[PDB]
Amino acid sequence: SLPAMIGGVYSDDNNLQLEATTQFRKLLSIERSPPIEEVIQSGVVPRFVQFLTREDFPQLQFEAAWALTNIASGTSENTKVVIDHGAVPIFVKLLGSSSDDVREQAVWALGNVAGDSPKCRDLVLANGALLPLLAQLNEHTKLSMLRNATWTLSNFCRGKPQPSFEQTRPALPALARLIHSNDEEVLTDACWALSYLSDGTNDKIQAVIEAGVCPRLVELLLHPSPSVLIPALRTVGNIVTGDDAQTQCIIDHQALPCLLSLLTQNLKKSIKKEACWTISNITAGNKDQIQAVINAGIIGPLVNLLQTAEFDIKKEAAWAISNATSGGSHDQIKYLVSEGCIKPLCDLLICPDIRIVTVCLEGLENILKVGETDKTLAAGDVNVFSQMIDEAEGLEKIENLQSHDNNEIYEKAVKILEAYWM
């Protein structure tokens, strides 16, 4: 069987070559546990790569590409064999083939190679795969190729360390168009790609925004499929980690009402968590952006999550409320208190995550400052917010933080107690 197949691929008879290659492909295409190792050891990889260059024989190119694709679907060591035999530049050249089946297969093969690791991704990019890949995406491209190409594109953008932004940037205009697909697989992969490109310094974010994607990304927050929502949400989140003007591009398209709906629908915890995280980077902004959060009606639901949600969600909500107390106006802070934020901030003063304890203490100190200002302006007897913290059992928790191993926490607690309770 295998000896006959090897003989077929190593013959110079067109039909034996095709027959034997096709047999190898079927072998590598079985339901599970394809014998990739055994095919590699048989020594046929170099011949398959030679077959890639037979432009007189598209069917053979296709079968060989399919087989090479499935070998590169295996382990890194499997993939290395394909690389060592020079397949990458040849696949890149096949992106220009007149055969649609061959082109699509080449796109898939390069996706598998780039998916192996950041080094393999970078090798594919360095062999000039990106432009040819984009080159044959147009108004007439069929769905199968659109899906394959979008998936491969996301592989070209994926991974840490991240690919050079100059090498992935040409992808942005195509991705900006692809997120307008209604196909869920295209949307999924295009959004993941944008999630990778938007994760980093603010210049990257700026390039993403300039590609025009904000309006559509926001629409996608309302997509019924979590497979689309998740990466769309991640990309929106990434964008609002940028500066105030960058963050404003998201707010301007009614993102905040969409985000609120993610908090109040019955959605996965991971989704609510990232919605909160996105919101916290908005409340990390200016007073107008904090006001936009308030106006959308987010605070009530957010406070409720801070009080009652799973811990991963509470952590993000804590940052969101605390950021707002830090950047917000006197009057804005008073509104957060009226929505009931004091008690759940106090409850978290005993949580095991010291970063969260610190965030909540900071929030409470900002609230206390507002309460003290209110007292002073009227020449009143009491800081009303200090009494509310006492009633919420926050004061005793802050007292006990004087015993904390962490200096930051310790110094802050003492400072807070000395300023507001003597």
């Binding site: 994760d199 980690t241 940028g242 916290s280 980077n281 990390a284 940052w319 950021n323 830090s326 950047g327």
Partner: peptide
């Protein structure tokens, strides 16, 4: 306050 990732 801005947190990447």
């Amino acid at each position: 306050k801005k947190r990447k990732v």
